[PDB]
Amino acid sequence: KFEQPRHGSLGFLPRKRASRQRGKVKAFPKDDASKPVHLTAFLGYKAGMTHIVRDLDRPGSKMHKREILEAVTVIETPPMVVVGVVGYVETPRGLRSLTTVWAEHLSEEVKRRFYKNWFKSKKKAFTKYAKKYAESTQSINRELERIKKYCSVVRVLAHTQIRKTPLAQKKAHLMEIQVNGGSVADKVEWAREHFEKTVDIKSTFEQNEMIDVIGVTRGKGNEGTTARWGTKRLPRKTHRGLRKVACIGAWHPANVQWTVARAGNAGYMHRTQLNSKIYRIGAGDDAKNASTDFDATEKRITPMGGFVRYGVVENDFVMLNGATPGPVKRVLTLRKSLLTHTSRKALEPVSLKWIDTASKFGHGRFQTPAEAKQFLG
Amino acid sequence: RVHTCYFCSGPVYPGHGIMFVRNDSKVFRFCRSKCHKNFKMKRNPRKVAWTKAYRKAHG
Amino acid sequence: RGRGAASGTKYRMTLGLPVQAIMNCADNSGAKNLYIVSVFGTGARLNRLPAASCGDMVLATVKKGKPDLRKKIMPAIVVRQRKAWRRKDGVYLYFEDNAGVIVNPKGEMKGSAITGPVAKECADLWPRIASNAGTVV
RNA sequence: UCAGACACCAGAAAAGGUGUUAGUUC
RNA sequence: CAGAUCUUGGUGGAAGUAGCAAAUAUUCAAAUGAGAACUUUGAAGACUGAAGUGGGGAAAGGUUCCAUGUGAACAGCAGUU
RNA sequence: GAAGUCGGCAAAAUGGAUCCGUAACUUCGGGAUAAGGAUUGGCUCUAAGGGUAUCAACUUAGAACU
RNA sequence: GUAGCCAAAUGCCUCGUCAUCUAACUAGUGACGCGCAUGAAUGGAUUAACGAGAUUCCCACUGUCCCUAUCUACUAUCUAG
RNA sequence: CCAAGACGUUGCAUUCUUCGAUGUCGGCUCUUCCUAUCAUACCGAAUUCGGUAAGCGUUGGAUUGUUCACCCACUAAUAGGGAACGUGAGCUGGGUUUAGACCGUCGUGAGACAGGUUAGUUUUACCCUACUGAUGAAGUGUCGUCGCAAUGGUAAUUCAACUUAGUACGGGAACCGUUGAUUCAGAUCAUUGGUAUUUGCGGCUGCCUGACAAGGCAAUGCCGCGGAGCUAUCAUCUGCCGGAUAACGGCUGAGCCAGAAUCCGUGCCAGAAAGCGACGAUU
RNA sequence: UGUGGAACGGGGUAUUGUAAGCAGUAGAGUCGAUCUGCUGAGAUUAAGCCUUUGUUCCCAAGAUUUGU
Secondary structure, rough: OOOOOOOOOOOOOOOOOOOOOOOOOOOOOOOOOOOOOOEEEEEEEEEEEEEEEHHHOOOOOOOOOEEEEEEEEEEEOEEEEEEEEEEEEEEEOOEEEEEEHHHHHHHHHHHHHOOOOHHHHHOOOOHHHHHHHHHHHHHHHHHHHHHHHOOOEEEEEEEEEHHHHOOOOOOOEEEEEEOOOOHHHHHHHHHHHHOOOOOOOHHOOOOOOOEEEEEEOOOOEEEHHHHHHHOOOOOOOOOOOOOOOOOOOOOOOOOOOOOOOOOOOOOOOOOEEEEEEEEEOOOOOOOOOOOOOOOOOOOOOOOOOOOOEEOOOOOOOOEEOOOHHHHHHHHEEEEEEEOOOHHHHHHHHOOEEEOOOEEEEEEEOOHHHHHHHHHHO | OEEEOOOOOOOOOOOOOEEOOOOOEEEEEEHHHHHHHHHHOOHHHOOOOHHHHHHHHHH | OOOOOOOOOOOOOOOOEEEOOOOEEOOOOOOOOOEEEEEEEOOOOOOOEEEEEHHHHHHHEOOOOOOOOOOOOOEEEEEEOOOEEEEEOOEEEEOOOOEEEEEOOEEEEEOOOOOOOHHHHHHHHOHHHHOOOEEEE
């Protein structure tokens, strides 16, 4: 008789809570020694989202050279400070971290990440390491020479400057970013020169790039099969209820199959959202970052009244296409896309015409406070 | 561009409202559901205190 | 097929006229209403009612009107939709009632004129309906 | 290119196969 | 006697589990007291709303009436009531 | 807008009063609140309707204005 | 086996034949009758009004459904008993 | 298999278990497997017939309890089966359906009918396991940070229009490319819609606080709008190229080559709570 | 013991629709529905909005477990 495709994807289970708050990069772009030394991932915070007006330069389309309204996501990306380097050696059992070398000075932001109770502690983290770096710089030199001689993959330890974002959290987020391009010696000397220095997102991404955003989705709590998997609601006559799956299995096998929908956690799950195009890489110091070439109308990216439950974006930000996993103010990972793509949609350059900065809190009718007072008496 | 609503008579920005067409081929660009619903209730903006149509048509 | 007889593609807009829906007959063919019995280009989706939107080609019967037109299936084109749909420029459009016109399988209107507004998607998709349209919004 | 492997026993036939190894008669 | 869904009595796992979710709803201060969500007084908020959750009787009960006293037990929490 | 379902099951819709209007059929009694329409607030007013110049009492008709 | 009535709550064959209703009906109604196996106080044929009786259709109506979503109280849940 | 696709020939009821009871159709719901392949991909012949092939999909309705069915359409297509004739402590109760009742036939009768017609209680999980998700003691000194990846899972699908091109070929293609849609999957809440205890603001009725004002009650009194949150194939965003092959065609003359929606990996989800590493500080 | 936390206050943002009070050569009428001005006012605004040279207050502690 009649059949239907399955509800849900068997590739995204178990539908359990993510073991991590911050999106982990499970695959870095394939290393190319011809390319110059560069980073492959940046770590930011979801400020919010808004919408833009854009002229669509897509030949052969029904709305070629005609304005489109497009939703965009704003991720605040203050520069990340490089504080260490880790070397990975390929082995018949996979990658193994041979050694890790840290910078001389680590800020309180990243030192908190090593503590659960930073207020109580004696703040002893990396104190003896800071000493050994002071008197005995030779030991550091042998460690990086070991990385150059043996390790085949070089990853920099870089942390966010969370104090610069309007977040209550004071612990920074520290992650490994693979350094692709050049020889292993080139990566290590690049890491050494960038110790304690800030790497901005302008160098990593170039305003028309397709990236993969990685993060944990917002938790929706425990849900039933109707909402966790999308099954049909049972009829109103149903005794004991209807927001359930009627037949959870057959007589044989005499077990419940893993492929049958059950109630359980639906949310807080690690996702990798592919092919997100950067529409704008705005600078925090620039006062024109929300102004386009056709609009003028000096304005900042933060909507009038502030970003809802985030604050005011004063640092560098990235305006991305579509949506990203996770709620506002969650840490998000922006990695370079693994796949090479030559589609017209993915290759066309993006020119913004107007950016909405009205109040997302409520039905904002005014882009800027100045013209709000002009319309008002 | 920027369109002027018919009920509230304020300015509208792209993708911040609805446009409605009657039988007589007349087009109305509503700004918000509030003015959207008031118009279908046949509520005259000239008698409604927060509309700029009132503020211009009553001095 | 229904889409093959159309000139150019059409953007995904909100369906608002599922099967069993009676909508006004907007041309002068003499029919008064149209009863949607199926919609062209409807694949296989269990328990899912076929539905139409402005410019979609449907199979309709005349529930009220001239007796020669009733008791038969003839193709129709949905020209006005009361359910709001989002154009790609960001504007949401809906009409004051649901309306359609009588056409042959190729796409030529049986009537000679259309009363009331006509959706621009329907006009772009079907040149003959655009030609017979008085106003296109 | 989904060999075979111990009676009962847990099963397959006709007819073929440039598969191959031996034979029979012109 | 190991059996008879044996007889009588006792005791387990389930299990600190099912559960104690109809009848709108209680709150503050004080008193008493070893102990107060529940007793009492005052204040507040409410309900039954005269076909009452009011005031009485018949049938039935039988002392449950009243004052005083209170270790338990009973009032499926508590209890000075 | 019944496509649900064995079936409009459940739900929704209607609903008081005033005025207008009301079919087939019929045992002439009914059907009938058939079906279908319109009207309804507040306030300031008058207009009538009773008892011995004066008292007592809600009950309908309008008229504006809002 | 008359007057009647009928694929009727009565017809196996059978989803009978024809018409009507619908886009489509093994349904309903109207009709036909060699009616397995209808029929006249084991009452036949009707029939206004009535019916929490059985069966169709129409309008209005709607979360019945497309296709779900949201909200409130009480649970469940944790806790003391 | 055979030659004259005939003739032939070879193949793909019983009463063992249950009567100190295994709930007994269909539909709905939902997952999985099978290939004897309807569609899709790729090949071989002469649209049709074939081979590989189960990756992916296989619908909306009318009558009927249905089953086999049959109609009205859509669609690339609307293939056939297994799972205790899969699925009742999942539902529903239409079919079956004790007791009430009606009809026909049969019986002297009580009654019968494998004839039709109506009305007719659908219990319990709180145990074990399985399956969801949720913590979690302990090896690794302790605690923490950053990782590794064994293994398990896996995902995308189809169509149309345009350009090729009115060209090839003699009426009418295909490769490429392009713009869009279908089904499915994962998110998101800028905009739009829905939702209202924001009891947020306004309005309305009855009663009550002497009136005003301001409130209260009406098991959330009602009405309008309503931010935030939630949420919608009612909204938006996102959803690939490697290798080894089958059929099958070549190369030399086994060994290679080309070669499918197949297969295994890249990628994506989980992370072994008895797999591991680097690092930090060490009362 | 800090660009610390909290409780409020101020500003922004948003929702509603111009509050109460008083005043009027407004008001059908014989006191009076309503209207106008002050008045896009007033109320509400984080409860999972933003921001604060503000105001007041709080914090250098108990318990418990851990050795290469």
